Structure formats: structure tokens, C-alpha cells
Amino acid sequence: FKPRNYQLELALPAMKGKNTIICAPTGCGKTFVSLLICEHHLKKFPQGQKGKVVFFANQIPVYEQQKSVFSKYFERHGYRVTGISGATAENVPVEQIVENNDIIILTPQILVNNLKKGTIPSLSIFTLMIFDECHNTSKQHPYNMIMFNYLDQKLGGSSGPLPQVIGLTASVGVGDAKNTDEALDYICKLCASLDASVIATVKHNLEELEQVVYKPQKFFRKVESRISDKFKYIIAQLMRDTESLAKRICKDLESQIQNREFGTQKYEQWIVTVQKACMVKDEESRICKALFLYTSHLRKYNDALIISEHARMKDALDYLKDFFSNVRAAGFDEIEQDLTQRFEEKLQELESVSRDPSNENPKLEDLCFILQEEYHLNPETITILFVKTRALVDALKNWIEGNPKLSFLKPGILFKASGDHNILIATSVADEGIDIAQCNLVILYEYVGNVIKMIQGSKCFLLTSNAGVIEKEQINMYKEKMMNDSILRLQTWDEAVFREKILHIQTHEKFIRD
């Protein structure tokens, strides 16, 4: 297990002996870095001198894993490594064990009990302390409980030798701060808590790190419906009429699905239920046939409304034309003739509103521009496009093929199985099961399907009509943003000015504690 460059970059300040917070992505080897720090530390002591290191785990699985890892690596090197946990043997008191072993894995609460008990008189016996998930060091957490003791001795000095402190965290957090400046102060509060003079992030080996941990940056984009949608207006009336016919012959149409809206997949479910009921005397038989015919047409309208919503009206209108060409292929019902003629009356108008340039879908214009922009950056890009329905898969594919501004794309329905298509349009079943995506770019086009996972500059675009989710992500990105900058700005300060700022807070925090 060769150390990665970014890992060595993180370890260095700690190896040079500064109290450090190591802030890096989950799964990038932060604990492994603490191990490198542990190894470097224990070698520093001259003959007849032993170091003593404590590792703090926040949860039992981390404790178990680190207990195994540290013992295997270090018992070989002649050090005595033990892990002591809540499920203690309860017979051997902890101090004998801390005296007996050079390296200890510790759930933080066990130590706290012993300090109050006085079995462990001081924190001085440790030479190195490591806090996994060190962001927890606040608000009367055991970490903080431990760190207070550290601080009292240091500040009320009268100070014995104190151990180096290392904190591991994926995120320092930013708390309640509504401002970058407020955000900075919070971060310093944590730094004061862990007596850290250095925050270590990977600046130099960002490229290498990104290979080890695979995160494609997520982009959330609001999308808007047409201000004026006459196409929806016309179709809904057709749907209203067809329902009115269906309602007349069946007194109690209401069937287990509520508040169906035109153009919704929920409406699709309602249709299916009603058809199911039909699948189950002349009059009873005749009515069953009529409903089935109606719901079948209502379903087609509903499909067309959904196409119109996320693609061109032309795509939606075309979809209706084929169906109504398809109905003619079969022997013409007397009823189908009527339904077909009712559609034919409104057609000329539908064509008119469909041709209008001003009637164009905003959502399509947004999608198009993102594709243009991204493929401009990287022609090599391969994209998977997730859409609401199968009918939409066909609409969007036709749209890309006929769009001269999207000539660079060659659309394919449905990795990589196929090299020749650089974009693929797909839709998937809504399940508890999750789909997996292997591509540079993922676009979620109003997609409510079961969640997606991305697999080896990659990005995912989430386009939604929901204001609430967009607002939430905007807050999150802001908070992230606040955190990095403040972190970046803190690294700017000299350690001497920085140390000053940290001391003041510990001093103030010690008195309120007093």
C-alpha cells in the first residue's frame, strides 16, 4: 500500500508536529494518513523514550476497523497495540492498559469516565491524539469533554506536557452562519476546540485525489413551462369531452385514484385502474367496451400532453396523428369514427399553434443550450439523458436528429456498449432498485425514476420544475461555498497571527466553563 501523493501532502504539517485538522473527502484515506502520522510520530522518540498515541473513534464500525488495522501494522513493528471499547472486560482497569500499550483505539466516552474517576490523572501521558470525525468536537460531546481537560491544563499553566492533536473530518461544518464572515468565526471555534494551528486540505494533488474518489459535480437547474399553452388548452378540452361521454354511460366512474390531472403520470395510473375494471347483460357488456375505448383515447391524450410539456408541440401532435392513423388501420368502430372526427375538428388549430415560434418550449431551449455549451467544452463527451416516459424517448431523439444546432450529437435510444452514439436517451421503471450510469455527463430531464449512480470533469445536471428543491440546493451550495473560502482564507494568515485568534476564544470559553 504505497502512500498516495495527496495523502503525503495531508500528513506533512502533522509530521512537522503542528496540531492539525485534516479535511478531505470520505474514503480518500484520512485514517490511513493518521496512521502515517502515527508511524512518523513514534519513530521520533530517542532510545529509552516511548511515545503514546490514542485514536478516538466516533462509532463502533470505525473502532472495529481501526482496531484491526493499527494492530496488524504496528504489532509487527514491536509496538503494543490494543483497542478498549464500551463492551469492556470491566476487570482490568483502563490505566494499566494505557500504561501497558503504546497505541490505543478508544471510544471517547470511556476515557471521560476515567478522568473524572481520576484513574487517568492527566492527558499528558498521551503524546498523540487522533479524532476521527473531529467536527463532533463541540456542544458537550465526549471529544469536547476530553478537549476541555486538555485546555484547562494548557491554559491554567502550571502546564504539563500536552500531546499533539489530529482531527479527521470530511467537513468542518459551517453551522448557523448566514455569512462568510460568520462562517469563518464558526470554523475557528472548532479549531480552538481542537487546538489546531493548521487546517490541511489537498491543494496540489487535486487531479490524483479525484481519481481515487469519484464525485461528479452536481448542477441543479430550474425549468419553466410555457407562459401560454394553447395546445394544452385544446387537448384538455378534448379530454374533458371524452370523459363527459364516459361519465354519462357509467353513473359512478369513481376508481381508487384521486385528483387526476391531465398530463400527469398519475392520470396514467387512473386510466390503468379503470381499464382493469373493464377487463373483468348487453348493456353491461356494451358499456364496458365503450369505457375501454374512451380510457384508451384518454391515455393517448395524456401521453401527448406529457410530450408537449417536455418536448415540442410538434412531437406531441405527431404522436397523436399516428395513433389516429393507427385507429383507422383497424376496422373502424362507429365510436372511433366519432372520437377521430372530434380530433379532426381541432387539428387545423393545433397545427397553427404548433407552428408558432413563440409557442416553443422553454425547457427544450434550456436543455439544448446546456448540451451546446458542454459539448463545446468537451467534444469527447458521452451523455445519458433520463426522461419521464417512453414516448418522450422517441420525441427527444427525433428532436435532436432534426435540430441543426445539435448536429454534433448522434442520438441513441437506451457501458459503453455502443461507441458510435455520443448521447443516449433513456427512461426507467420507478422502483426501490437503483439504475447505474457510466458516462461523462448525466442529464435528469424532469426525471422522477429510481435514483441513479454515476461510475467511472464529469457532471450531472438535474432539471426540475420544483422551486423547493432548487432553493434547498442553492442554500447547500452556498454553505459549501462559504466553507471553502473561509478555509482558503485561513490558510493565508501566518501561524503567529492565527495562533493569537485561537487563544482568545479558548480563554473566553474557559471562563464561561469556569
CATH number at residue 341: 1.20.1320.30
How many angstroms separate the CA atoms of 362 and 226, rounded? 6
Q: Could you tell me the three cell numbers for 478?
A: 452556498
How many angstroms separate the CA atoms of 65 and 455, rounded? 26
Residues in binding site: 24-31
Q: Which of 360, 387, 406 is the last residue of a domain?
A: 360
- 146 touches 112 (CB < 8 A): yes
Residues in binding site for ATP: 24-31
Q: Could you tell me the three cell numbers for 106?
A: 478508544
Residues in the chain: 514
Q: Please, is 405 exposed, middle or buried when counting C-beta atoms within 10 Å of its C-beta (0-12, 13-18, 19+)? A: exposed
Q: Which of 334, 360, 386 is the last residue of a domain?
A: 360
User: Which residue(s) pair with 168 in the sheet?
Assistant: 22
- CA distances 457 to 29, 46, 158, 415, 507, Å, are 22, 48, 54, 18, 45
**E strands in 376-429:** 383-386, 411-413, 423-426
Residues 203 and 263 reside in one and the same domain: no
In angstroms, how far is the first alpha carbon of the chain from the final one?
47
Output the DSSP codes for 456-476: ---EEEEEES-HHHHHHHHHH
- 19 touches 198 (CB < 8 A): yes
Output the DSSP codes for 139-199: TT-HHHHHHHHHHHHHHSSS-----EEEEEES----TT-SSHHHHHHHHHHHHHHTT-SEE
CATH number (domain holding residue 99): 3.40.50.300
- Method of determination is X-ray
- 35 touches 1 (CB < 8 A): no
How many domains would you assign to the chain?
3
Residues 122 and 186 reside in one and the same domain: yes
Residues 261 and 136 reside in one and the same domain: no
- 223 touches 463 (CB < 8 A): yes
Residue type at 371 in one-letter notation: L
Q: Which of 301, 329, 360 is the last residue of a domain?
A: 360
Place of cell 432548487: 470
Q: What is the dihedral of CA 310, 311, 312, 317, to 10 degrees?
A: -90
Helix (H, G, I), strand (E, B) or coil at 21: strand
Q: Could you tell me the three cell numbers for 113?
A: 469516565
